[PDB]
From a paper:
Landmark proteins called autophagy receptors bind specific targets and interact with Atg8-family proteins on the isolation membrane through the Atg8-family-interacting motif (AIM) (also called the LC3-interacting region, [name]). The core of the AIM is composed of four amino-acid residues [W/F/Y]-X-X-[L/I/V]28. The first aromatic residue and the fourth aliphatic residue bind to two hydrophobic pockets in Atg8 (the W- and L-sites, respectively), and the main chain of the motif forms an intermolecular parallel β-sheet with a β-strand (β2) of Atg828. Nonetheless, deletion of the short helix from RTN3245–264 reduced the interactions with mAtg8s. Thus, the C-terminal helix-assisted AIM/[name] is a unique structural basis commonly seen in the interactions of yeast [name] and these mammalian ER-phagy receptors with Atg8-family proteins.
Residue numbers in the entry: 6 to 137
């Protein structure tokens, strides 16, 4: 009948993606490490990469990556996929705040828009194209 007005704010209402890393490392320790690493490497951003709970592909043992601010999401996909156990026929998707980012985005763009108050950017991955 009538139009439905979609609002960007809806994206922000979803609950945060799971992060064992956040839960098991006290906030102040994370924030101190993130601030220090940002000062040390002004051309890089610190990223935490974790499996979405519903993902059906292999887990990732190493979570902490320091990435060039100009690396693109497509390049990051290549590098991270190399480290996960999945079939060539398995898919791989990344999520930042529950949303799949563009292949063309840079890690510095994602970091500026989405880093948390500990100065880390959190990315989840799944073989499914929805976070859960």
């Amino acid at each position: 009948d009538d139009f439905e007005l979609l609002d960007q704010s809806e994206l922000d209402q979803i609950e945060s993606m799971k992060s064992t890393y956040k839960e098991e490392h006290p906030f102040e320790k994370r924030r101190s490490e993130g601030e220090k690493i940002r000062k040390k490497y002004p051309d890089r951003v610190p990223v935490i990469v974790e499996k979405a709970p519903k993902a059906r592909i292999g887990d990732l043992d190493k979570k902490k990556y320091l990435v060039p601010s100009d690396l693109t999401v497509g390049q990051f996909y290549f590098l991270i996929r190399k480290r996960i156990h999945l079939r060539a026929e398995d898919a791989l998707f990344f999520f930042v705040n529950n949303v799949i980012p563009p292949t063309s985005a840079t890690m510095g763009q994602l970091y500026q828009e989405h880093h948390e108050e500990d100065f880390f950017l959190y990315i989840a991955y799944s073989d499914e194209s929805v976070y859960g």
